[PDB]
């Protein structure tokens, strides 16, 4: 559902399956992190469910030996001289050596300034040791971490659990319709987007012959040309959008390896799984209580967070002893306002709006025979209605979805196609809807903070700065210090600095904090993008100094002070808030847990075969499981009639079900509950086990 999920599904290490160990078979020891996991398998990326620790993800520098063992690169230091020669070591070869720290005080001559250096010993022990006897060093920081976790800015400032959950929610972001690139990120985003395979990359250099939405024609230097056929509005395996927008012009030159077109979640060929939203971290009137998040109506109106969702509906007409099922408009006992948007071929016109309950394909099956009710005969005698000898099991839009139709694909035997033996028509329809953001949709950062939309309140009722720009998203302040994810506050401040722009006054030399800050980072235009490697990034002092000088955009207004907080005016009452609060630009992402695909309810649906209990799930009409644990609560309450109702007539007693429905429709008193059918099933089953079980009246 985004390039990162595809990237992380491959290059993932599992432990269950043939020859592996099941989760029940899995002990506590295996789920733990071994000291050998370093550099080979990421210790953060692992699902939070029962499979925690069982399945993980490969490192970013990890290599698989031609022998099946895993292997990681490391630079070899000799007599305190660091070499460029990269040699690869397995887990067992690391014990007989001493690897150094990734970020060590290198002086460019190979000699660490202090003798004692953080090193990893044979048995995974970390300890001090003089420099002359170490023989290996990490090739780089972020070597122990995977690609899904290397995209988290300020990773080292976050708790392991919250980093784990942030890395997992990065996998399940949705592709929006614009995919703005993040202001604050890591260099891994570009590579992750490039090698995910879903962004068009010019294999051979050359000038662009012509550009269009459908395709790009690029003229190589050696005369010949190549046409990249762009893929537009393709349904992903999770029903998301996969549009590809070219980002080149008709006369530009592109080099081999340059990104030609962007995928679903990419901007200028780099990963972009969310949007840059202005954030105030105050707790606002309880609508952002208990991890809840409140949003402004600007996001709804400006389509900042909206996703195109596509579903497919297969339906096949197959041979049958009754004859053949026809994809036709000869649909019995239907009106005409619902027949307006079907072609005579029998299917919905392309570009026509449907909704829950509308017909999609007209497929009519020979009904065969049944008991024609006498009342049916009197019914046809009153109007002259035909018998209508066929059954209309046509395909209808399932409950709770709508949208426009994107495409129709039809296959049939007379089209000399390789249909399965038995079916002779098969039509599949694609329906898409521009799902906007509403209450209940889950939004999250890449730092572990999550929450559903508590409310979307209008632009008036938003705290706004002295400039008058309303804040977009407000999150609570009571979660960040307890849950230990202060890294995202640093991300917020760095994002505000990157948005407003900055310049460090190099008049009387460089300041003390900026001495180690690299050049070209002392000046930043407004809306400038920055980067931060996970374990070697902007320090507290550097960020504080950047916050000190944060030159305004248009007017003379330093909205935020040196400490990050800023004054902001209440939009509800109008008076200024008593104390300043932190504000800044945060990178938020919409998760694939939307409330539209999560709301379900039923009054009287279908039931199972053996026991008359209703089925479960969303594909079927469902019905919530009232387990024995809730039976404990209802018994503890002392409510007996409610429990008996929930057991016998609401679930099991068939005659009870129909009588209750008739009584409630007729406005009559609900009758006495009967005997559950599952108990009779159990009695017959026990009898079949040679157990004489009889219930005695007296």
């Amino acid at each position: 559902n985004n390039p990162l999920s595809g990237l992380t599904h491959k290059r993932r290490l599992s432990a269950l399956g043939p020859g592996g160990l099941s989760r029940e078979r899995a002990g506590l020891e295996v789920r733990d992190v071994h000291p050998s996991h370093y550099g080979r398998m990421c210790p953060i990326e692992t699902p939070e469910g029962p499979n925690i620790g069982l399945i993980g993800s490969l490192s970013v520098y990890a290599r698989v030996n031609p022998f099946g063992f895993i292997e990681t690169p490391y630079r070899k230091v000799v007599d305190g001289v660091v070499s460029d020669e990269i040699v690869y070591l397995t887990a067992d070869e690391e014990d007989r050596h001493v690897v150094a720290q990734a970020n060590s005080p290198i002086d460019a001559d190979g000699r660490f300034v202090e003798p004692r250096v953080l090193v990893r010993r044979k048995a995974g022990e970390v300890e001090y040791v003089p420099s002359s006897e170490v023989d290996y060093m990490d090739v780089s920081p972020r070597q122990m971490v995977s690609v899904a976790t290397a995209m988290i800015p300020f990773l080292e400032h976050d708790d392991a659990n919250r980093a784990l959950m942030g890395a997992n929610m990065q996998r399940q972001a949705v592709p929006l319709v614009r995919s703005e690139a993040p202001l604050v990120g890591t260099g891994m985003e570009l590579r992750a987007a490039i090698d995910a395979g879903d962004v068009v990359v010019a294999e051979e250099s050359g000038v662009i012959e012509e550009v269009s939405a459908d395709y790009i024609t690029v003229m190589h230097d050696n005369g010949t040309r190549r046409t990249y056929r762009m893929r537009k509005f393709a349904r992903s395996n999770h029903g998301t959008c996969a549009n590809q927008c070219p980002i080149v012009d008709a006369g530009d030159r592109v080099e081999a390896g340059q990104v030609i077109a962007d995928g679903p979640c990419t901007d200028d060929g780099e990963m972009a799984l969310g949007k840059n939203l202005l954030v105030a971290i105050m707790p606002w009137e309880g609508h952002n209580y208990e991890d809840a998040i409140i949003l402004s109506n600007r996001l709804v109106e400006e389509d900042v967070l909206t996703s195109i969702h596509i579903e497919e509906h297969e339906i096949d007409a197959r041979d049958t002893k009754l004859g053949a099922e026809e994809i036709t408009r000869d649909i019995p006992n239907i009106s005409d306002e619902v027949l307006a948007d079907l072609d005579e071929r029998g299917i919905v016109r392309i570009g026509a709006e449907v909704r829950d309950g509308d017909i999609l394909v007209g497929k009519v099956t020979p009904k065969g025979e049944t008991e024609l009710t006498p009342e049916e005969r009197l019914l046809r005698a009153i109007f002259g209605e035909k018998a209508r000898e066929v059954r209309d099991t046509s395909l209808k839009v399932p409950h709770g979805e709508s949208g426009k139709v994107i495409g129709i694909r039809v296959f049939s035997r007379e089209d000399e196609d390789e249909l399965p033996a038995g079916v002779n028509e098969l039509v599949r329809v694609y329906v898409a809807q521009k799902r906007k953001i509403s209450d209940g949709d889950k939004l999250a950062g890449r730092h572990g903070n999550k929450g559903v939309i508590g409310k979307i309140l209008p632009v008036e009722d938003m705290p706004f700065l002295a400039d008058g720009t309303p804040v977009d998203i407000i999150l609570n302040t009571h979660g960040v210090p307890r849950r230990m994810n202060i890294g995202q506050i640093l991300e917020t401040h760095l994002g505000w600095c990157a948005h407003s722009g900055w310049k460090v006054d190099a008049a009387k030399g460089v300041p003390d904090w900026a001495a180690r800050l690299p050049d070209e980072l002392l000046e930043a235009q407004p809306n400038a993008i920055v980067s931060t490697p996970v374990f070697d990034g902007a320090q507290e002092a550097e960020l504080q100094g950047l916050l000190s000088c944060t030159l305004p955009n248009r007017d003379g207004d330093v909205l935020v002070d040196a400490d990050g907080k800023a004054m902001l005016f209440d939009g509800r009452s109008g008076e200024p808030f008593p104390y300043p609060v932190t504000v800044g630009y945060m990178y938020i992402m919409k998760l694939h847990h939307l409330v539209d695909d999560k709301i379900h309810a039923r009054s009287t649906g279908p039931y199972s075969m053996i026991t008359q209990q209703p089925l479960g799930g969303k594909a079927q009409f469902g019905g919530q499981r009232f387990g024995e644990m809730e039976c404990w609560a209802m018994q503890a309450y002392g409510a007996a009639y409610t429990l008996q109702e929930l057991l016998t007539i609401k679930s099991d007693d068939t005659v009870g079900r129909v009588k209750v429905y008739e009584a409630i429709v007729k406005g009559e008193n609900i009758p006495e509950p009967g005997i559950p059918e599952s108990f009779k099933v159990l009695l017959k089953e026990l009898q079949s086990l040679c157990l004489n079980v009889e219930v005695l009246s007296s």
């Binding site: 970013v60 090739v139 260099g187 592109v254 340059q258 200028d268 490697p533 070697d536």
Partner: peptide, 21 residues
């Protein structure tokens, strides 16, 4: 960098990586 169409991403990184990912 080392990518032909790489946008200008300024970096706070102190040391350099001997090999690319």
């Amino acid at each position: 960098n080392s990518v032909p169409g790489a946008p200008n991403r300024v970096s706070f990184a102190k040391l350099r990586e001997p090999l690319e990912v």
